[PDB]
RNA sequence: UGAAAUUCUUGGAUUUAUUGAAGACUAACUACUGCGAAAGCAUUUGCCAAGGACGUUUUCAUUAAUCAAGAACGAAAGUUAGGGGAUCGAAGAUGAUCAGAUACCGUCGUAGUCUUAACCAUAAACUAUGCCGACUAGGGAUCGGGUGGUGUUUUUUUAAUGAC
């Protein structure tokens, strides 16, 4: 229960701290100076990397944290974290205000997969292992409304926002049997899937690359893969 | 009549939270989580209050909450040979011995204590020290005479020594 | 052992590569009590996701103290068997399989210089339950007694065992299963053993040692859900 | 009144008492063997002489003047002297201590209570 | 918020077993054996090993969720010895030094009310 | 096990939990207690007959004590012919043969351990102590029965029993 922050370039570990209690979750924004750690106990612990402090703790979850997601961009004030629980919960906390925002409670399993993009109004992409993903649109204000919800058909470990060549949003969902699929957020259809090892496996993660122009595949037997989506996305063929 | 020698160390030491129930005829101990500080006080002091019910001395007791490799062995005669009638009374005065010698004899070679309640035995030391005496006060169960258990004390005795 | 110097075994020759973490297919499941107790929540446990899952949730029976299901320190030497018998939304629904004492109390009870009486009945509920019942009784010594022991002639533990025998059958003939464990709670029993069984001797430490589930009937989950509300 | 439950518990420690302190007997009456009950006897005289006149004594050689009981005459001395049987030592021992004995006889504002016995503790 | 698990401590003259399960018993959590963390045989029963197997079960424990559980100490019993040795007196020490809290304590130990013949014989055993 | 190897174990050992089956055996209560001529006898309930002691202002009237000959029972082990065979286990094989407090340990285990119908008749089968009868000191513990009290508890309506 120490977390340790080491810089590569300098070669040594800047900061060490304590945490409350163990954290299997941990997620560093975009912008790579902010770090959310998720404990068991449902505490939520925010951290400058440069700097080494304390920023936020949210104390508000009850299950343990399976899912942290952070949301922000460069030069401005929306920024925002979402945090899911075992339990189902969805949280979006608001950094500024330092405050729950909207709280979501549909997903009945662990949620697993957060992501929020910003709808030119911003939209929340939940997933859990409960086999479904839920669309839900919001904002600052006490508007949290959910739009759809996509039977997946696989245990969702991950799951984010896809832009196509065109610009038709796109939802990439990696989960159980070692599959990578995806699925247009209107019609609802899998587009692209990944054919399923023999072996059973997992993936237990995805790592997105290149402005989500690739992606790796971490399996649970420790081999990671890589796949080039956006070249896929315009091959006709369905097989990524 | 010992209490008053009891609950000093506990409740200062190990900064536990005593009480003894009439009701119920059993000690009872609390960890304070504003005042206690070790994690193990509270087993440790279970331990100690245990081994003072098995029939030990207080002092030797304290050793546990002084030390944590101290340790209870404990066993029937029964378990060894099953000896009954006079076979079974002669054979607890074995162990004792005349005036209780016997009993002291070992104790002092391993570095134990000994109560032989009736055909119940209880041993504590550490787990070297225990297993050892779980031989000698055997041995005399099965039959040895305790002068020659004596003589291999004595030898046990001195090897305890040069380590 | 472990060590490499312990010699080698045949069992290391054909190994599966540990690959899959099990508890990453496991799935937990919530474990409720019935009604009758106090603490509907009694914990939760872990099976494989169904490829089904609850097949293996029936038939799943777990020990708990009553202490903890009636949130009272009487009961910390009391033991309950919950069986599962229904699964809804990771909810199982459990009933009551057996009920028995902590070891350190029985062998407390049994003490020098006193009689034990147990007494046991094998009789059915007005559910088809069939079930077995120990009681275990112990002499006392009067207020005023002033021999060292209190042992008790034959003809009065037979006396004594013969009107156990009654009232034991009695309750459970006349009540079903739900019944029986609304009357174990409390222990209304064992004072009612004790008053039939005051003028034939005097008696302490009266209770009801153990319970068994012998037979049960055909399943009915219409009589679960009202169990359960 | 509360007295007779006072009167009862004097009485029950008695009986325990006389129980143990009977306890301690019969298991100490059935052990009859000679080296243990000699070994008895012993440390009893020893200890009998350092804690705890001479009409008495002129009274006990007049007695044993006169009936000759402590010499080889007795029925189990003269058995045991006939029959090459107190050559052994340990019966000489018992033989020659009853002569002994018999011959000690014949001898002449600014800037403007007990704690935890049944309570917690 | 706490979940609650069964220590089932098992404690041999020759090994000790230390088994984590969930409240049914049927799943298991985690066990680890007196062997697990030793070389030699002779210190299989050590409560050095105990010590460090207790240690190894209650990191799992943690990882996989469990934050307390209750303990049901055993020995060999039936025709043995009926009391636990040492050694799962110091894995019941490591259970509480490692932080995981005690529900219950209890012993479990097999007690036949008639059991067969001893492997002794008349003259006895345990040399 | 003092220390190890034969040995079982990835067709999953050991361990966990819900059961089922086989054959013994009645732990803890169990005691300076009880019953039986002795050897012996410890779960619940029923049947069969048997027995000591106590109470009796009931009955027969010497019918009694001891006992060669003669007869019944007789610990464990053992023999014959069936059944059963869980555990243990003489015999036997085999792993190991290093170290003296742990120096005889492990695995397999035949006869045997259990039962039915028959044979033998030996023990420190001891209290190293014939049986029957009378008499010869105080004390209080226990078992069974009986008698007595204006004693306690209980019968939680009394009571009477039962327990003290
Ligand atoms: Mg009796
Ligand atoms: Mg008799
Ligand atoms: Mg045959
Ligand atoms: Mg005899
Ligand atoms: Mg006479």
């Given at each position: 229960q120490l977390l340790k922050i080491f810089h590569?370039?300098?070669?040594?570990?800047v900061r060490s701290m304590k945490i409350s209690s163990p954290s299997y979750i941990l997620d560093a924004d975009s912008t790579s100076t902010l770090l959310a750690v998720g404990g068991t106990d449902g505490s939520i612990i925010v951290v400058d990397?440069?700097?080494?402090?304390?920023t936020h703790s949210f104390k508000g979850?009850?299950?343990?944290?399976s899912s942290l997601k952070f949301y922000g961009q460069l030069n401005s004030k929306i920024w925002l974290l979402a945090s899911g629980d075992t339990n189902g919960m969805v949280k979006v906390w608001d950094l500024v205000k330092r405050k729950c925002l909207h709280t979501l409670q549909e997903h009945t399993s662990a949620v697993r997969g957060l992501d929020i993009i910003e709808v030119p109004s911003l939209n929340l992409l939940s997933g859990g292992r409960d086999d479904i993903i839920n669309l839900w649109d919001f904002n600052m204000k006490k508007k949290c409304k959910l739009l759809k919800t996509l039977?997946?058909?696989?245990?969702?470990e991950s799951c984010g926002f896809l832009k196509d060549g065109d610009g038709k949003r796109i939802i990439y969902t990696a989960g159980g049997d070692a599959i990578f699929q995806l699925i247009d957020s209107?019609?609802?259809?899998?587009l692209k899937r990944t054919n399923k090892p023999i072996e059973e496996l997992f993936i237990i993660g995805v790592l997105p690359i290149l402005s989500n122009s690739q992606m790796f595949l971490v399996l649970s037997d420790q081999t990671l893969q890589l796949i080039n989506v956006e070249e896929d996305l315009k091959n006709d063929e369905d097989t990524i | 009549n010992s209490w008053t020698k009891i609950y000093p160390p506990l409740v200062e030491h190990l900064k536990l939270q005593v009480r003894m129930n009439l009701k119920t005829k059993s000690v009872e101990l609390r960890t304070n989580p504003?005042?206690?500080?070790?994690?193990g006080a509270l087993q440790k002091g279970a331990d100690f209050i245990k081994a003072f019910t098995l029939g030990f001395d207080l002092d030797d007791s304290i050793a546990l909450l002084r030390l944590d490799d101290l340790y209870i062995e404990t066993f029937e005669v029964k378990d060894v040979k099953t000896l009954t009638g006079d076979h079974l009374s002669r054979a607890i005065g074995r162990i004792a011995g005349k005036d209780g010698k016997t009993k002291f004899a070992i104790e002092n070679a391993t570095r134990t204590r000994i109560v032989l309640a009736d055909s119940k035995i209880h041993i504590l030391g550490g787990f070297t020290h225990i297993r050892m005496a779980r031989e000698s006060v055997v041995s005399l169960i099965l039959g040895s005479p305790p002068g020659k258990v004596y003589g291999n004390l004595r030898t046990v005795a001195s090897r305890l020594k040069e380590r | 052992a472990v060590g490499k110097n312990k010699r080698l075994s045949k069992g290391k020759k054909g190994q599966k590569k540990?690959?899959?973490?099990?508890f990453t297919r496991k799935e937990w499941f919530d474990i409720k009590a019935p009604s009758?107790?106090?603490?509907?929540?009694?914990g939760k446990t872990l099976v494989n996701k169904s490829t089904s899952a609850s097949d293996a949730l029936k038939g799943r029976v777990v020990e708990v103290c009553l202490a903890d299901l009636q949130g009272s320190?009487?009961?910390?030497?009391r033991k309950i068997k919950l069986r599962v018998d229904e699964v809804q939304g990771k909810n199982l629904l459990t009933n009551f399989h057996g009920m028995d004492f902590t070891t350190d109390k029985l062998r407390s009870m049994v003490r020098k210089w006193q009689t034990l009486i147990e007494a046991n009945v094998t009789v059915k509920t007005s559910d088809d339950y069939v079930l077995r019942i120990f009681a275990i009784a112990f002499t006392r010594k009067q207020?005023?007694?002033?021999?060292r022991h209190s042992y008790a002639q034959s003809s009065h533990i037979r006396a004594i065992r013969k009107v156990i025998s009654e009232i034991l059958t009695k309750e459970v003939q006349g009540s079903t299963l739900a019944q029986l464990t609304s009357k174990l709670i409390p222990e209304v029993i064992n004072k009612e053993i004790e008053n039939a069984t005051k003028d034939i001797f005097p008696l302490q430490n009266?209770?009801?040692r153990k319970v068994k589930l012998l037979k049960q009937p055909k399943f009915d989950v219409g009589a679960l859900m009202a169990l359960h509300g | 009144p509360e007295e007779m439950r006072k009167r009862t518990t004097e009485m029950r420690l008695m009986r325990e008492l006389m129980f143990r302190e009977e306890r301690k007997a019969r298991r100490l009456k059935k052990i009859k063997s000679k080296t243990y009950r000699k070994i008895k006897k012993k440390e009893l005289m020893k200890n009998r002489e350092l804690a705890a006149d001479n009409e008495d004594h002129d009274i006990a050689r007049a007695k044993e003047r006169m009936t000759?009981?402590?010499?080889?005459?007795?029925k189990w001395a003269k058995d045991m002297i006939k029959?090459?049987?107190?050559?052994?030592?340990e019966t000489r021992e018992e033989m020659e201590e009853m002569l002994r004995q018999g011959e000690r006889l014949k001898a002449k504002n600014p800037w403007l209570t007990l704690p935890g016995w049944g309570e917690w503790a | 918020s706490q979940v609650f698990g069964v220590a089932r401590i098992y404690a041999s003259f020759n090994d000790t077993f230390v088994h984590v399960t969930d409240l049914?018993?049927?799943?298991?959590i985690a066990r680890v054996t007196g062997?697990?963390?030793?070389?030699?045989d002779r210190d299989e029963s050590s409560p050095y090993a105990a010590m460090l197997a207790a240690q190894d079960v209650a990191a799992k424990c943690k990882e996989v969720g469990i934050t307390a559980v209750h303990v049901k100490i055993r020995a060999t019993g039936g025709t043995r010895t009926k009391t636990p040795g040492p050694g799962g007196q110091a894995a019941l020490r490591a259970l509480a030094r490692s932080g995981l809290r005690i529900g219950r304590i209890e012993d479990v130990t097999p007690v036949p009310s008639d059991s067969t013949r001893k492997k002794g014989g008349r003259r006895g055993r345990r040399l």
């Open positions: 590569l370039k300098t070669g040594k570990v990397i440069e700097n080494g402090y304390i979850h009850g299950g343990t944290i039977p997946v058909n696989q245990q969702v209107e019609s609802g259809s899998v | 504003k005042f206690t500080t070790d994690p | 540990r690959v899959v973490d099990p009758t107790f106090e603490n509907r929540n009694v320190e009487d009961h910390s030497f207020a005023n007694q002033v021999k009266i209770h009801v | 000759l009981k402590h010499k080889t005459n007795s029959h090459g049987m107190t050559n052994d030592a | 049914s018993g049927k799943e298991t062997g697990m963390k030793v070389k030699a």
